[PDB]
Amino acid sequence: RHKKLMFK
Amino acid sequence: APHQEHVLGEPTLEGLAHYIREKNVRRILVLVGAGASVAAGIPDFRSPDTGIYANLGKYNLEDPTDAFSLTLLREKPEIFYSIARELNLWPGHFQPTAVHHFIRLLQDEGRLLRCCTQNIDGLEKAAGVSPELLVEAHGSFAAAACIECHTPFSIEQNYLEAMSGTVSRCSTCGGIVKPNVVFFGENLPDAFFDALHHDAPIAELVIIIGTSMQVHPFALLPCVVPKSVPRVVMNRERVGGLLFRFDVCRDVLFRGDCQENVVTLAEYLGLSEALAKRMRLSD
Ligand SMILES: [Zn+2]
């Protein structure tokens, strides 16, 4: 489980 | 080339419907993103003649997606609240599309394993996809809560405050309240992890409509289904990089309007009357 993210 | 023989036989909407019927496919995982709801009239962040885009300008963001950042919300809540006022995502404004009604039909046919949506528009729910079968992986505007202590807040109060220019505040800690949209940096709901660990590994078919693959962990869903099951992508863009090959040949990309493609799929599935009937009944 990890939090909502995006690679920027 | 033999190594290109497709798991679907013919990698077409016709072949897909045949495959579903001939193999009696009952465990269909449907994933849904922003492309599915364009036809409902949802304002695209990225479109220059929208009201939503005009707003974002003054603030100057290295991405419309920073409006959904938890750290920007704590710092300058006026920014997300200003976007919330313009998107009109409160339930009961937008109506479900042909894609949304289709998923409801899959459920009523006993073929839906789970519907997992990254949209925050509540349209799957508006189309009658049941609670046990629907995962709103990024929440929606249906309920609200404090971001500091997680205490629920009246959505009706939050709506009235937001739409009149007021940032809502927790009556326990003075924290900032927002609708229960999952922001960048927040936890996804449990039901997302249920779907990832328990549904996707047993899918017989995955149909991925209008999604990006660039928001995580949501984008893992189609990566964890069995290596042999068909993965159908309906999108206006060639998405997924090298994770998709449009190990057996099992991926297909259907370009064009996902609303039209679902209607065609429905025809071949023998569901065209049920779909036209849902579509009239609420447009
Ligand atoms: Zn609080």
Numbering used by the authors:
A (entry chain C): 379 to 386
B (entry chain A): 7 to 252, 324 to 360
Article sentences:
The proteins belonging to the Silent Information Regulator 2 (SIR2) family, also known as Sirtuins, are classified as class III HDAC proteins due to their dependency on NAD+ to deacetylate lysine residues of histones and non-histone substrates. Here we describe the first high-resolution crystal structure of Leishmania infantum SIR2rp1.
Deleting 51 residues from a proteolytically-sensitive region connecting the β8 and β9 strands of the catalytic core led to the crystallization and structural resolution of Leishmania infantum SIR2rp1. Crystals suitable for X-ray diffraction could be obtained only with LiSIR2rp1(ΔP253-E303) mutant, uniquely in the presence of the p53 peptide substrate. Crystals belonged to the P21 space group and contained two LiSIR2rp1(ΔP253-E303) /p53 complexes per asymmetric unit. In addition to a small number of residues missing at both N- and C- terminal ends of the protein (N-ter M1-R6 and C-ter A371-T373 are missing in both monomers), region R52-P70 could not be modeled in monomer B. Moreover, additionally to region P253-E303 removed from the recombinant protein, electron density was missing for residues A304 to P323 in both monomers, suggesting potential flexibility of this region. The zinc-binding domain comprises a two-stranded antiparallel β-sheet with four α-helices and includes a Zn2+ ion coordinated by four strictly conserved cysteines (Cys152, 155, 176 and 179).
